[PDB]
């Protein structure tokens, strides 16, 4: 109904799934067609990774009071974040792969253990293994 009341709903939904998330992986999405994003979206459903593009202002508001606050430095530019409903630290590997293979977007940041990890030092998430 109300676009402010839709924001009251989108903020409450993206933060409620941030309650159960384990590792947040944020990245860029501009310059890529639709069906190419669904190559990852099917890859997120099978790995239990929730992927949802929300606005930068909305994101900060939502993640306030949550361990993913330090990510306010990376919420500029087009934003494609990934949550880890199950299998913690798995989104990252998939993300990095797709990025360097065929697109122009990069991995803005990751968010494990409620701290911010810069783009080049995220091989740490890749090194961590599924258990």
């Amino acid at each position: 109904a109300l676009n402010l009341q839709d924001k009251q709903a989108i903020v409450a939904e993206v933060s409620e799934v941030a309650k159960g998330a384990l590792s947040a992986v944020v990245a860029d999405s501009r310059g890529v067609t639709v069906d190419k994003m669904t190559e990852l979206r099917k890859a997120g459903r099978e790995a239990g990774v929730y992927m949802r593009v929300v606005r930068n202002t909305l994101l900060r508001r939502a993640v306030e009071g949550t361990p993913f606050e330090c990510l306010k430095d990376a919420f500029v530019g087009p934003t494609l974040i990934a949550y880890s409903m199950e299998h913690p630290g798995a989104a990252a590997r998939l993300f990095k792969e797709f990025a360097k293979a065929n697109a122009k977007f990069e991995v803005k940041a990751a968010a494990f253990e409620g701290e911010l990890i810069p783009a080049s030092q995220i091989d740490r998430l890749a090194t961590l293994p599924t258990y």
Binding site: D35, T38, K42, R45, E46
Partner: protein, 134 residues
């Protein structure tokens, strides 16, 4: 790069294939019998869509897809033609297990892996074709 819908066992006719990829430099005969070679397994008289993929050196590859839903929906329904106009007359009733059979047939084409969602997409398409579900 070109997309066609070719009969399961026959690539012989000139007008459907000749002009579209002749400019691309596709060797007609090659694609004809490669296409037929792999589409041998398809049921007789199933029109199947193929995406032909040509490169600067005129060489090509292709992917075969699942037949168009409307062609595949009227065969299960056993209705040779199509509904003249919906919301007035329905030519038959499509079965539910057939919708999921159709859903797993075009599993690759559908973007949703929910399978039940695939059925809804197929059912929605059928609804536009004037059929009703039991």
């Amino acid at each position: 790069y070109v997309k066609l819908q070719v009969a399961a066992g026959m690539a012989n006719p000139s007008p459907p294939v000749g002009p579209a990829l002749g400019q691309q430099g596709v060797n007609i005969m090659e694609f004809c019998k490669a296409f037929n070679a792999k589409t041998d397994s398809i049921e007789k008289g199933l029109p199947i869509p193929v995406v032909i993929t040509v490169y600067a050196d005129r060489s090509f590859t292709f992917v075969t897809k699942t037949p168009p839903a409307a062609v595949l929906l009227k065969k299960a329904a056993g209705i040779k033609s199509g509904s003249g106009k919906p919301n007035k007359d329905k030519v038959g009733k499509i079965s539910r297990a057939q919708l999921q059979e159709i859903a797993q047939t075009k599993a690759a084409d559908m973007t949703g892996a929910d399978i039940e969602a695939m059925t809804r997409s197929i059912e929605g398409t059928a609804r536009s074709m004037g059929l009703v579900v039991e």
